Amino acid sequence: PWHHIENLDLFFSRVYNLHQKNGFTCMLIGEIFELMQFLFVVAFTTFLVSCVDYDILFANKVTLPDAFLPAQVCSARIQENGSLITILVIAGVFWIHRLIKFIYNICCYWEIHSFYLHALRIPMSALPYCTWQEVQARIVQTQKEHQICIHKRELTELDIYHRILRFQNYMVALVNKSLLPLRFRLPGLGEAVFFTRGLKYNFELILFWGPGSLFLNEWSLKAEYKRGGQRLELAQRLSNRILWIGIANFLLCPLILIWQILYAFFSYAEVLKREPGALGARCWSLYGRCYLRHFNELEHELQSRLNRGYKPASKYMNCFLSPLLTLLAKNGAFFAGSILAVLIALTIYDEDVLAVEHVLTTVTLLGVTVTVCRSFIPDQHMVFCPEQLLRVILAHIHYMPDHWQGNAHRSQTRDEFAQLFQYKAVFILEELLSPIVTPLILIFCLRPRALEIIDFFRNFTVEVVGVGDTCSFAQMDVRQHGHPQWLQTEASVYQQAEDGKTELSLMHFAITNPGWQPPRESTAFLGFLKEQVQRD
Amino acid sequence: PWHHIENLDLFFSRVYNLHQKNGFTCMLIGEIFELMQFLFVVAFTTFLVSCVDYDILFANKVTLPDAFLPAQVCSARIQENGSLITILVIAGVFWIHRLIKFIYNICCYWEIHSFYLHALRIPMSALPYCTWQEVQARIVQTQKEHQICIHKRELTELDIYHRILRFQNYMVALVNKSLLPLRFRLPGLGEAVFFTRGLKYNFELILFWGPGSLFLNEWSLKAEYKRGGQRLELAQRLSNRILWIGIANFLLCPLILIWQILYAFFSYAEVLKREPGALGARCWSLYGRCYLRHFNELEHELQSRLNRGYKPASKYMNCFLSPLLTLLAKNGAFFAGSILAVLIALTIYDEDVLAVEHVLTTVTLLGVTVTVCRSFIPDQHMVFCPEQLLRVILAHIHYMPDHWQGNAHRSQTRDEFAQLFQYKAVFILEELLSPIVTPLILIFCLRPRALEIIDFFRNFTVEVVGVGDTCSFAQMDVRQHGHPQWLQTEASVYQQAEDGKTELSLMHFAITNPGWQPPRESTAFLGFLKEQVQRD
Amino acid sequence: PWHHIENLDLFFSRVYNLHQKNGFTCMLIGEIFELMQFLFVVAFTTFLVSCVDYDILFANKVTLPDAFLPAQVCSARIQENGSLITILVIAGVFWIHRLIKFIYNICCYWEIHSFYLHALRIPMSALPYCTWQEVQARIVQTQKEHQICIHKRELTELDIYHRILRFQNYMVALVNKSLLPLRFRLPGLGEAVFFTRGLKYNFELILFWGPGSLFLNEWSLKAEYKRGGQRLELAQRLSNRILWIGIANFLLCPLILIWQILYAFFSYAEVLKREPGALGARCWSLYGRCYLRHFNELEHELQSRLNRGYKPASKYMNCFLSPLLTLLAKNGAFFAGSILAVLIALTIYDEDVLAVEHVLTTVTLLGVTVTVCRSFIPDQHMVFCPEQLLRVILAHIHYMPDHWQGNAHRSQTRDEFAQLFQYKAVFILEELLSPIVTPLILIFCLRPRALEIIDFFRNFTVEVVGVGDTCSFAQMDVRQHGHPQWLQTEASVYQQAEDGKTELSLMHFAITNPGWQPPRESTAFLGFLKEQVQRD
Ligand SMILES: CCCCCCCCCCC(CCCCCCCCCC)(CO[C@H]1O[C@@H](CO)[C@H](O[C@@H]2O[C@@H](CO)[C@H](O)[C@@H](O)[C@@H]2O)[C@@H](O)[C@@H]1O)CO[C@H]1O[C@@H](CO)[C@H](O[C@@H]2O[C@@H](CO)[C@H](O)[C@@H](O)[C@@H]2O)[C@@H](O)[C@H]1O
Ligand SMILES: CCCCCCCCCCC(CCCCCCCCCC)(CO[C@H]1O[C@@H](CO)[C@H](O[C@@H]2O[C@@H](CO)[C@H](O)[C@@H](O)[C@@H]2O)[C@@H](O)[C@@H]1O)CO[C@H]1O[C@@H](CO)[C@H](O[C@@H]2O[C@@H](CO)[C@H](O)[C@@H](O)[C@@H]2O)[C@@H](O)[C@H]1O
Ligand SMILES: CCCCCCCCCCC(CCCCCCCCCC)(CO[C@H]1O[C@@H](CO)[C@H](O[C@@H]2O[C@@H](CO)[C@H](O)[C@@H](O)[C@@H]2O)[C@@H](O)[C@@H]1O)CO[C@H]1O[C@@H](CO)[C@H](O[C@@H]2O[C@@H](CO)[C@H](O)[C@@H](O)[C@@H]2O)[C@@H](O)[C@H]1O
Ligand SMILES: CCCCCCCCCCC(CCCCCCCCCC)(CO[C@H]1O[C@@H](CO)[C@H](O[C@@H]2O[C@@H](CO)[C@H](O)[C@@H](O)[C@@H]2O)[C@@H](O)[C@@H]1O)CO[C@H]1O[C@@H](CO)[C@H](O[C@@H]2O[C@@H](CO)[C@H](O)[C@@H](O)[C@@H]2O)[C@@H](O)[C@H]1O
Ligand SMILES: CCCCCCCCCCC(CCCCCCCCCC)(CO[C@H]1O[C@@H](CO)[C@H](O[C@@H]2O[C@@H](CO)[C@H](O)[C@@H](O)[C@@H]2O)[C@@H](O)[C@@H]1O)CO[C@H]1O[C@@H](CO)[C@H](O[C@@H]2O[C@@H](CO)[C@H](O)[C@@H](O)[C@@H]2O)[C@@H](O)[C@H]1O
Ligand SMILES: CCCCCCCCCCC(CCCCCCCCCC)(CO[C@H]1O[C@@H](CO)[C@H](O[C@@H]2O[C@@H](CO)[C@H](O)[C@@H](O)[C@@H]2O)[C@@H](O)[C@@H]1O)CO[C@H]1O[C@@H](CO)[C@H](O[C@@H]2O[C@@H](CO)[C@H](O)[C@@H](O)[C@@H]2O)[C@@H](O)[C@H]1O
């Protein structure tokens, strides 16, 4: 609760994170569990590889520990493996770095916990039931007593938003203006979108937080990037920086590939054996979390919007069925159910139809076949309405390409709605492929864009008095960043928010935070909008 | 895409069918699968009857093909069966007729495929996502360039409807005016309705397409039926025709009975072993598909209406529970679950309670008993609302007897809503009974109505300039076929659409096809209706 | 259908009960089943205790009846048990009393059956589909012909309500004004509510129907309780009466405890073995059936309101999840699914991984663990809205504390909504604990309130001309029993309906029974309410 604290972006971010992971104790436990999962994957894997005698386990009454070798021998058997010892040393160094960051993080989170209890007065018991809106209103009222925000002003409830979301507004504006290569033209497929967790991590490590990034403070852009001249040498320097970060990625490829595979296998294989159709359900697509996101939108508001609108979207995606697969399913079900009905009537009649060379395996395989086909057979009496489903999905989601509203029922619309909605299986596949795909996209597809990235960060970076250097769009300025088709805008092409992000983002903010005082242009815009809504 | 083609009814029907079975390839495959199902049922059955040595299979390690007899012996064993060889010869003749019709059909469908691609310009890829409305608008715009409709006029979008649905409007009007015996008074039951697939096939074979039917062209009624005189000799001729068609049915009874038995056995026996309650779900009742159908309503519009309104109807049917069966279920569940809980506690305690003469079979039978009873026990906390359920079911369905709206909750209403909604099990039973029941209804209950059928076809058959001879009701003429209670109508009794079919059918058509230009009386009617709706 | 019958409260109650248990036959069967369940529990239990030779059954091919001992020995083995014979004699005396009451009840119900058939003219076939509203309208029209209601007036449709619900309105008003101890302050828990079936039975046996109750006739209060004086001696007499009834409860404690144990064991043990999560579903809480109930509300109207509003309430209760349990579930699922995926991959690879000392039991236990955790893991994409859920729950339920409407999302609101909504498991536990808890609450917590109970029954008991002595609140008088905050009321504190029961109860009655003629003040109140609703 200190006066003139430190970097305020971090303080506010930590406060927000403490509200999200409901309380200090919960958060501490969550982090500890996160550290134990890594160590368990690595140690379980190295135990399975190195200490277990599979031959005795398989064939050659045997108790479980009859397989395991004694530690006095496991240590020697794992030590005489240069590749394994090297992977373990790199894994242990990453782990120790993560454990040290965790200790430092909890030592800094006890300070936020004391902030809550003593200056906000929200006990950790009343924190899960507490409405981040109420939390930040407490903070804004506290700004008087326990002084913060070194010496600029009183907090204005959007400052906190800018502090928590400075780099995320930059990502939103980068992806919104089609920098940052995502679309690819694969042979044998349409234009794929490849945006993963590792790729966005690399983009942020290149642009925002690193040794030689664009930013020096975490709230101020380096002084040269604001200068119009010397843009070409800056572009060359950025290109070399991203080249070498891509090469580090290419060299770390084997280790991250191993991690993604062990790890994929340690959860999704269980789910596969249980319910193989859980991976046929669809998830909201990291590209799509960044596309459908308003500018100053905290994570919980985006996710509330995203799951309010999830079941409409599943009803839409299941409308759409291929006739050929449906017919193949129907008829395979007929023929398999016929042979199975005959074999079942026989095994019921005499009961010795069973234990005939292949009858039992045949019954089981035929049952699996009938079940798969019946899962592919659409439910008769299914209401097919892709227009109203798309209308309600939009009402929850707020952003959609413009060539969707008319032709809701075509393959073009369905095909690029799957850009946003994504079978979970292609998610797991796409997270597996990112170790081997991220370096080459990073080296080849982004380095040509470095001169456009430099011009973005020079052109769209405003200095706001209290917060520092923020994105130019996240101001929610209807002027200078509007879009003439949605709407007064003093914005030409290249200087405009594409899918209506400025207008819809300002509306979403004004609706979610009713306490905020809207500037002149924003107030006039919202008033004219309300007049048009109530009039028309 | 030819000029002055052929019979246009067939051309249009084929075009519509090609749109429905989404594309030529899909349709071809579907027909091939339809041909392979027949051949598989017959060949699998004759293999099970004739080639398999059940004794060795049952009792007397044995591989599966140890049962089968060698073909050099299967041929002789199937050939020395006069009944089997005769059934196989009749089956093979029906098959060859169906295969020849299939070859002719695909040779005629390649012409419709070329029509699409070259004159409509809708590739087979864009056809599943294509909206029959858009397809027929293409057709109506094409009528200028690739000339069709030999020489009468330009197409008016209702001509295509009449062409595709000429005989189906006749069936709708026949069933609507209570010709065509459907209601029967069985002893021990209420008035049953027996309308099947085979019965309607026989009605159409008698009336519409045959050697000596009412129609000579497929678009023109024979010349004598338009004459008022000689009605009695025509009635006698029709009565003799239907007598001999009924006798052909009675003679073919054994073969169609065998077909229905086998074919139901295969599929529904599999479903029975899987989920015996799937046959307790209810389907929309061939009588009911013809009762709830508007006049000029293509199959996909009826089915869209029928499944939009399916779940309300299931919620209605499950409201209604017999108290005696509910009480018997509750108490049988109590006593069975009590004995099973005791036996389960014992088998858990010692684990040797099992392998006691009858304990395991008792546990299994008691589990089945508890599950059946719990399925019959209504869900407590079930909202019982048969008035609003009937209101929404009507909103989807549009046609309901008039003595339903008040007493939605009685046994009279539920009992004759099951005329339309029909357990799937009574559907399979009613399709099994049709081989043995259709000849006797056809000989006894319809031959007395022949003089009324002749008067129907003489009185209600208009000659419309472009289309030929169509039903008089399907014109959707508010005059001369109205109903005074629904509504100006110059229609007395016997000359009126009963359940409001004219008014509601004209409204449904005007709503589904917004491009159609409504005649004077229809326009005035729809305008007055809109004024009354917006006023009241 | 007799003229000047008997006590009319009983006649009307019986008529209502006959309508509820749909018909005489159904009702008779239900009662017979109720008698057979008691006898079966007792006889099955005494057979399991006394006649079965568990040693031979467990260890020492054996047919089931090899366990049972011959009756010539079972009689002697059950007779030489003083405790068992005593429990059986008390059980048989209670049974014989119940059988005698059943015979008398059906001999009195044949009279109501003849009443229906001959004076109301509703056959038992048309009775399940018959709408108690229609039944009582028949009754009110019958009041002219088959004369009833000895000589006061014609029936006014609220008289029947008072007759059926005289003592239940008293319970509603007792619980509504916080007499009748329900809230308790347990250590280690919040303020528990303990209101069971046995406790309310004891309250009614003390107050309403007994040897020396408050009422002498069933429709008239004893003459002394109307007198202001002698209140202290009446309070002492009531205190002694409730002391001795509590002591009878304390002495009968072992037998009712045995009954509850057995009876819960049978049914809920079966359900436990089947679906252990059925006991995690929530039920509407005997306290809560009495709290949410309007004054003159028959049982079926309350239950219709209670299940119309059940699924909203379950959606509310499940949008509250503890973060710590959710995190523990997620991570236990991870670690268990990881070890199980490894063991499953091994058993798939070689198939002899199985039959290794503990692998199969480990796979089963791990599967149970993963399933339990996945049940505790909240469904991602779950819409969390406790404000609109509470709004719709209120719309169905009509009564709620006033400090709920604002903070729908807190632990205070959830914690005292579980007062009304109650896991089924705590219901079964709370019905088990009532034999041992009811005597001590009855002796200690209610005897101090006897002087307030006397003042309640003296102050709030009006003599209405046709019905006799009814509760003062159940008149639905907006004056003299209103509440100034809801609303003209001439009611001070202690003389007012707390949660708005008078106003909302009068509204519910006027809406459910549209035929009733509302008195002056009630009519003016309802009119002003309608004017305010349509105005604001
Ligand atoms: C110049 C060099 C550049 C090279 C850079 C490489 C970039 C890619 C590296 C990827 C990696 C390196 C680890 C490799 C280990 C090697 C050891 C050898 C192993 C041999 C045996 C770190 O990278 C992750 O780090 C995260 C931050 O830690 C980032 O998100 C930040 O996180 C927060 C901040 O605390 C804030 O929310 C915010 O700041 C960011 O959102 C991620 O964006 C990033 O992918 C892997 O860590 C990852 O593990 C995966 C599960 O595989 C985790 O999955 C997630 O959570 C699971 C449930 O828990 C679910 O299962 C899974 O569905 C879910 O998705 C990831 O979350 C991540 O933890
Ligand atoms: C040739 C030079 C190369 C040297 C190594 C650098 C390699 C490049 C990355 C280095 C990297 C991890 C390694 C990447 C993971 C690899 C995955 C696979 C690897 C194994 C397969 C270590 O990060 C720091 O580690 C420090 C030591 O631990 C180093 O000491 C330095 O010197 C000392 C004195 O001068 C200083 O006192 C000391 O403070 C310095 O830090 C630093 O050099 C380094 O920057 C960066 O990761 C991390 O960056 C941070 C922001 O920084 C990210 O911030 C998160 O999100 C932001 C929200 O907006 C906010 O930032 C923040 O709210 C949030 O927490 C994290 O999400 C996190 O991901
Ligand atoms: C003077 C003499 C009069 C005698 C007339 C008899 C009238 C009754 C005969 C009935 C029969 C004779 C076959 C007997 C074989 C004997 C061989 C011996 C066997 C010994 C071993 C033909 O009759 C059917 O023919 C159809 C046309 O082919 C008709 O519909 C037309 O169809 C289209 C046009 O192509 C157009 O849509 C339109 O024009 C009509 O809608 C049907 O109405 C008619 O029932 C049987 O065929 C039938 O098989 C059944 C499944 O049993 C099929 O079931 C349907 O599809 C299944 C999924 O695929 C499902 O399982 C099933 O749920 C579903 O219901 C039927 O569809 C039908 O194919
Ligand atoms: C004592 C005389 C008796 C002779 C036999 C006739 C027996 C009566 C029916 C004969 C029957 C099948 C047999 C019934 C099935 C039996 C089931 C059980 C049987 C085994 C247990 C064969 O139909 C034709 O077969 C031809 C040869 O294959 C014959 O050759 C003739 O002579 C040549 C030169 O003069 C000519 O060139 C040749 O074109 C002639 O056809 C014809 O006689 C016969 O009409 C009719 O079935 C079929 O009728 C057609 C419309 O016709 C129905 O149309 C469908 O729906 C309509 C949509 O609106 C439209 O029509 C159409 O869009 C659609 O496709 C079909 O749904 C279909 O069902
Ligand atoms: C001075 C002395 C005072 C002492 C008073 C004690 C007060 C508590 C006694 C409790 C007891 C004494 C029996 C003990 C047997 C001892 C024999 C020895 C056994 C050794 C081996 C009678 O008490 C019950 O009697 C009922 C009336 O009969 C009362 O409700 C009235 O009922 C109607 C009127 O007919 C009218 O609706 C109305 O008037 C009241 O609503 C109940 O409120 C009362 O609890 C037990 O009876 C009970 O059995 C339980 C199931 O355990 C029954 O459960 C219910 O139905 C089940 C499905 O059927 C379900 O499973 C269960 O979920 C459900 O809850 C109860 O319903 C009840 O029948
Ligand atoms: C030291 C004296 C003690 C003597 C014994 C009395 C003990 C106290 C209760 C006695 C009790 C059962 C015992 C309690 C259960 C115990 C559970 C565990 C026990 C074993 C562990 C027997 O009830 C009666 O039984 C009679 C004989 O069978 C007795 O004969 C008497 O003398 C004769 C000539 O003068 C008379 O002709 C004869 O008519 C007298 O009845 C009476 O004394 C007794 O009142 C009362 O239970 C019952 O009360 C009735 C209303 O009364 C309740 O009414 C129900 O709900 C009401 C709706 O608003 C309405 O009333 C009604 O619509 C409905 O039906 C019932 O729900 C029911 O529960």
Please indicate, yes or no, if residue A340 is contained in any of the structural domains.
yes
Where a domain ends, among A121, A155, A189?
Answer: A155
Please state, in angstroms and rounded to a whole number, the distance separating the CA atoms of residues A525 and A509.
13
Contacts of C143 (CB under 8 A, 6+ apart): C149, C154, C155
Experimental method: cryo-EM
Tell me how far apart the alpha carbons of residues B506 and B524 are, in angstroms, rounded to a whole number: 12
Name the CA radius of gyration of chain B, rounded. 28
Nearest CA in chain C to A31: C327
Q: What is the H or E stretch that residue A261 is in?
A: helix A231-265
Q: Mapping DSSP to helix (H, G, I), strand (E, B) and coil, where does residue A16 land? A: helix
Distance of alpha carbon A45 from alpha carbon B72, whole angstroms: 60
Tokens of B307: 């499944």
Q: C129 CB near a chain B CB, below 8 Å?
A: yes
- How far is it, in rounded angstroms, from Cα C523 to Cα C510? 10
Query: Residue A10, Cα to own-chain centre: how many angstroms?
Result: 21
Q: Which of C20, C94, C204, C205 to mutate to test the pocket of ligand 6 (most atoms within 8 A of CB)?
A: C205
Number of Cβ within 10 Å of residue A321's Cβ equals 16
Instruction: Supply angle C-alpha B230, B235, B238, rounded to 5.
Output: 125
The verdict on C439 and C335 lying in the same domain is: no
Report the separation in Å between the CA atom of C455 and the middle of ligand 6, taken as the mean of its atom positions.
26
Structure-token pair, residue C343: 């063991």
* Helix, coil or strand: residue B7: coil
Instruction: Kindly determine whether residue A323 and residue B265, on different chains, have CB atoms separated by under 8 Å.
Output: no
Asked whether the beta carbons of residue A409 and residue B63 sit closer than 8 angstroms, the reply is: no
| C388/A400 Cα distance (integer angstroms) | 27
Nearest to B352 among C22, C59, C64 (CB): C59
C-alpha–C-alpha distance, residues B208 and B225, integer Å: 13
B26 touches chain A (CB under 8 A): yes
Phi first, then psi: give them for residue B164, nearest 5 degrees. -75, -30
Nearest CA to ligand 6 atom 31: C211
d(CA B26, CA B39): 20
Question: Which chain B positions have a beta carbon within 8 Å of C23's beta carbon?
Answer: 323
Q: Report the residue from A22, A36, A265 with minimal CB separation from C323.
A: A22
d(CA B171, CA C469): 69
Whether residues C110 and C201 fall in one domain: no
Question: Hey, how many other C-beta atoms are within 10 angstroms of the C-beta on C274?
Answer: 16
> Which of A134, A137, A107 is CA-nearest to residue A24?
A107
* Measured distance CA(A33)–CA(A27) in Å, rounded: 10
Please list, in sequence order, all residues whose beta carbon lies within 8 angstroms of the beta carbon of residue C112, skipping any fewer than 6 positions away: C11, C14, C15, C18, C24
Query: How far is the C-alpha of B165 from the C-alpha of B167, rounded, in Å?
Result: 6
Q: Report DSSP state, residue C279.
A: G
Q: Are C235 and C450 in contact (CB under 8 A)?
A: yes
Asked if B267 reaches chain A (Cβ–Cβ under 8 Å), the answer is yes
Cα separation of C276 and C257, whole Å?
24
Token representation of residue A219: 């709230």
User: Residues of B with CB below 8 A from C48's CB?
Assistant: 342
Three-state DSSP string of B120-187: HCCCCCCCCCCCHHHHHHHHHHHHHHCCCCCCCCCCCCCHHHHHHHHHHHHHHHHHHCCCCCCEEECC
Residue C524's contacts (CB-CB under 8 Å, 6 or more residues apart) are none
Rounded distance between C-alpha atoms, residue A164 and residue C363, angstroms: 45
CB contact under 8 A, A129 and C352: no
Residue C191: helix, strand or coil by DSSP? strand
DSSP state of A120: I
- Both tokens of C115, joined, read 């009443």
Answer for the pair B207, B214: CB distance below 8 angstroms, yes or no.
Answer: yes
Alpha helices per DSSP H over A21-158: 24-50, 54-58, 71-79, 82-114, 132-145
Cβ(B221)–Cβ(B460) below 8 Å: no
Task: For residue B282, give the DSSP letter.
Answer: B
- Asked whether residue C486 is assigned to any structural domain, the reply reads no
Element (H, E) at B468: strand B468-470
End-to-end CA distance of chain A: 50
Vertex C81: Cα angle to C79 and C82 (nearest 5): 105
**C271–B338 CB contact, under 8 Å:** no
Domain for residue A29, yes or no? yes
Instruction: Classify A494 in phi/psi space as left (phi over 0), alpha (psi -120 to 50) or beta.
Output: left
Q: Quick one: A126 exposed, middle or buried, by C-beta within 10 A (0-12, 13-18, 19+)?
A: middle
Q: Which of B472, B466, B445 is nearest to B226 (CA)?
A: B472
Please judge whether C63 and B358 are an interchain contact, meaning their C-beta atoms are less than 8 angstroms apart.
yes
Contact of C279 with C426, CB cutoff 8 Å: no
Q: Which amino acid is at C225?
A: Y
Return the number of other C-beta atoms located less than 10 Å from residue B86's C-beta: 11
Q: Comparing C-alpha atoms, which of A501, A507, A496, A498 is closest to residue A533? A: A507
User: Chain B contacts of C62, Cβ < 8 Å?
Assistant: 356-357
What burial class does residue B510 get, using C-beta atoms within 10 Å of its C-beta: 0-12 exposed, 13-18 middle, 19+ buried? middle
Spatial distance between the Cα atoms of A88 and A95, rounded to a whole number of angstroms: 10
Residues contacting A364, CB < 8 A, separation 6+: none
- The protein residue whose alpha carbon is closest to atom 27 in ligand 2 is A97
Dist CA B298 CA B306 (whole Å): 13
Give yes or no for a contact between B176 and B497, defined as CB atoms under 8 angstroms apart.
yes
Please give the distance, rounded to the nearest whole angstrom, from the Cα atom of residue A216 to the centre of ligand 2.
14
Inter-residue contact A120 to A127 (CB < 8 Å): no
- 3-state SS, A413-431, equals HHHHHHHHHCEHHHHHHHH
Helix (H), strand (E) at residue A173: helix A159-176
Q: How many CB atoms lie within 10 A of CB B36?
A: 13
Burial class of residue C23 in the structure, from the number of CB atoms within 10 Å of its CB (0-12 exposed, 13-18 middle, 19+ buried): buried
The answer to whether residue B2 is domain-embedded is no
How far does Cα B521 stand from its chain's mean position? 34
Regarding whether B20 and B141 lie in a shared domain, the answer is yes
Residues B211 and B434 sit within 8 Å (Cβ to Cβ): no
A531's CB contacts (< 8 A; 6+ apart) are none
Residue A378 tokens read as 């659409």
> Alpha-carbon torsion B254, B256, B260, B266, what sign?
positive
B342 contacts C266? CB cut-off 8 A = yes
Beta strands in A311-425 (DSSP E): none
Per-residue CA distances from B243 to B238, B251, B447 (Å):
8, 12, 7
Taking the C-alpha atoms of residue A169 and residue B20, their distance in angstroms, rounded to an integer, is 48
Same domain, B228 and B104: no
Dist CA A135 CA A22 (whole Å): 12
Alpha carbons C278 and A321: distance in angstroms, whole number: 36
C103 C-beta neighbours (distance < 10 Å), count: 9
- Statement to judge: residues B124 and B63 lie in one domain: yes
C522-527: long-range pairs with CB below 8 Å, 24+: C522/C476, C522/C477, C522/C478, C525/C478, C525/C487
Residue with CA closest to ligand 1 atom 27: A201
Residue with tokens 């678009």: B219
Q: What is the largest CA-CA distance in chain C?
A: 92
CA nearest to C262 within chain B: B338
Q: Which two tokens stand for residue B518?
A: 């409504």
B30 and B79 belong to one structural domain: yes
Helix or strand run (H / E) with residue A183: strand A183-185
Sort strands B191-193 and B462-464 into parallel, antiparallel or unpaired: unpaired
Q: Which tokens go with A399?
A: 């952003």
Asked if B323 lies within 8 A of C22 by C-beta distance, the reply is yes
**Which residues of chain B lie closer than 8 angstroms to A323, CB-CB?**
21-23, 26, 128
Percent helix, strand and coil across chain A, each to the nearest 5: 65, 5, 35
Report the distance separating Cα C220 and Cα C218, nearest Å.
6
Q: Report how far residue B476's alpha carbon sits from residue B458's, in angstroms, rounded to the nearest whole number.
A: 18
Residues 6+ apart with CB under 8 A from A269: C341, C344, C345
Q: Which two tokens stand for residue B172?
A: 């709708």
Question: Which residue on chain B is closest to C39 by alpha carbon?
Answer: B335
| Minimum Cα–Cα distance from B274: chain A residue | A367
The span from the CA of B445 to the CA of B437, in Å, is 11
Q: Mapping DSSP to helix (H, G, I), strand (E, B) and coil, where does residue C353 land?
A: coil
Alpha carbon distance C532, C536 (integer Å) = 6
CB C201: neighbour CB atoms within 10 A? 12
Return the DSSP state at C185.
E
Question: Which residue minimizes the CA distance to atom 63 of ligand 2?
Answer: A10
C163, exposed or middle or buried, with CB in 10 Å at 0-12, 13-18, 19+? buried
Question: Phi/psi at A115 (nearest 5 deg)?
Answer: -55, -55
Gap between the Cα atoms of B377 and B329, Å rounded:
6
- Residue among A353, A357, A381 minimizing CB distance to B58: A353
Contact C115, C1 (CB under 8 A): yes
| Strand-strand pairing, A468-470 and A462-464 | antiparallel
Say what the resolution is, in angstroms.
2.8
Beta strands C191-193 and C183-185: pairing type? antiparallel
Which of A333, A353, A376 corresponds to the end of one domain? A376
| Contacts (Cβ under 8 Å, ≥6 apart) of B82 | none
B40–A338 CB contact, under 8 Å:
yes
Is the distance from the beta carbon of residue A263 to the nearest atom of ligand 1 less than 6 Å?
A: yes
Which residues make beta-bridge pairs with C169?
none
In three-state secondary structure terms, A97 is helix
Atom of ligand 4 nearest to the CA of B255: 21
Residue A323 and residue B131: Cβ atoms within 8 Å? no
CB A139 within 8 A of CB A448: no
- Hey, whose CA ends up nearest to atom 19 of ligand 4? B94
Q: What three-state secondary structure class fits B503?
A: helix
Amino acid identity of residue C509, one-letter, is: F
Determine the Cα angle at C336 with ends C335 and C339, to 5°: 85
A82-114 and A71-79 helices, crossing angle to 10°? 100
User: CB of C252 closer than 6 A to ligand 6?
Assistant: yes
Rounded Cα distance, B507 and B498, in Å: 16
Type of residue at A54: Y
List the structure tokens of B258.
């065998």
Query: Token pair 């296998």 is at which residue?
Result: A265
Whether the CB-CB separation of C503 and C522 falls below 8 Å is answered with: no
Whether A316 is in a domain gets the answer: no
A156: exposed, middle or buried (Cβ count in 10 Å: 0-12, 13-18, 19+): middle
Which residues 285-324 of A have a C-beta within 8 angstroms of C?
304, 306-308, 310-311
Residues of chain C found within 8 Å of residue A40, distances taken between Cβ atoms: 335, 338
Flag if C411 and A129 touch (Cβ within 8 Å).
Answer: yes
Q: Which residues contact B412 (CB under 8 A, 6 or more apart)?
A: B403
Kindly report the length of chain C. 536
**Does residue B452 sit within a domain?**
yes
CA dihedral C233, C239, C245, C250 (to 10 degrees): -150
Q: Is residue A44 in a domain? A: yes
User: Using CA atoms, how far apart are residues C239 and B409, in angstroms rounded to an integer?
Assistant: 51
Q: Are residues C354 and C271 in the same domain?
A: no
Task: Tell me the C-alpha distance between C373 and C330, whole Å.
Answer: 7
**Cα C104 to ligand 6 centroid, rounded to whole Å:** 13
Residues B417 and B415: their CA atoms lie apart, in Å, by 6
| Best mutation target, A338, A372, A385, A416, to test chain B (most B CBs within 10 A) | A338
For B464, the enclosing helix (H) or strand (E) is strand B462-464
Q: C395 is written with which tokens?
A: 């719309």
Looking at the complex, does the CB of residue C273 fall below 8 Å from at least one CB of chain A? no
CA angle B195, B197, B199 (to 5 degrees): 60
Indicate which residue's Cα is closest to atom 29 of ligand 1. Answer: A201
Based on the number of CB atoms within 10 Å of its own CB, is A65 exposed (0-12), middle (13-18) or buried (19 or more)?
exposed
- Contact assignment for C337 to A26 by CB distance below 8 Å: no
- The encoded tokens of residue C174 equal 């007792």
Yes or no: say if A278 and A144 are a contact pair by the CB < 8 Å rule: no
Q: Evaluate whether B446 touches C164 at the Cβ level (below 8 Å).
A: no
Residues from chain B that touch C266, judged by Cβ atoms under 8 A, are 334, 337-338, 341-342
Q: Residue A412 is encoded by which pair of tokens?
A: 């073009």
Q: Give the number of other Cβ atoms within 10 Å of residue A334's Cβ.
A: 21
Phi-psi region of B428 (alpha: psi -120 to 50; beta: other; left: phi over 0): alpha
Q: How far apart are CA B103 and CA B110, in angstroms?
A: 11
Taking the C-alpha atoms of residue C146 and residue C148, their distance in angstroms, rounded to an integer, is 7
Phi/psi of residue A148, nearest 5 degrees: -145, 180
Count of structural domains, chain A: 2
In a domain, C510, yes or no: no
Residue of C449, C500, C503, C515 lying closest to C478 (CA atoms): C503
Nearest CA in chain C to B383: C308
* Cβ of residue A209 lying under 6 Å from some atom of ligand 2: yes
Breaks (C–N over 2.5 Å) after residues, chain A: 60, 487
Nearest-angstrom CA–CA distance, C489 and A125:
43
A57, A266, A311: residue with CB nearest C341: A266
CA of residue A97 to ligand 2 center, whole Å: 9
DSSP summary character for residue B116: I
Q: What phi and psi values does residue A220 have, to the nearest 5 degrees? A: -145, 135
Instruction: Report the nearest atom of ligand 1 relative to the CA of A45.
Output: 21
The H or E element spanning position B26 is: helix B24-50
CA distance B417 to B307: 16
Specify whether B353 is located in the same domain as B447: no
Range(s) of the domain holding residue B74: 8-146
Q: What is the DSSP letter of A192?
A: E
* Distance separating alpha carbons of residues B469 and B216, to the nearest angstrom: 11
